[PDB]
Amino acid sequence: DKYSEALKDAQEKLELAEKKATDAEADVASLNRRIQLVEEELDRAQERLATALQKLE
Amino acid sequence: LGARAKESLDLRAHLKQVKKEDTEKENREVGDWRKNIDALSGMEGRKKKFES
Which cysteines are joined by disulfide bonds (chain A)? Predict the structure, then answer.
């Protein structure tokens, strides 16, 4: 009996952890792509702003 | 008449030239310098301090 309950609890916690961390890894990939896109936008802004300062002068 | 005109205009030009001398001395070193904000993209995200 003790093993039966421990196995049921173990399966539920295993499933919860697995779904949590699969969601977390999907978030990892998505957030990687979001960071790269905003970073490229930022770089573009930096070139524009450099030219902007030159033209201001 | 020419002497009166010369004296007046010479005094005027003397004050004008003394005024120019100050501008002749310096013309750009009175303004402050450039320190605009830009770039910084390479800085890290987890700041060594917790104001992150």
Answer: none
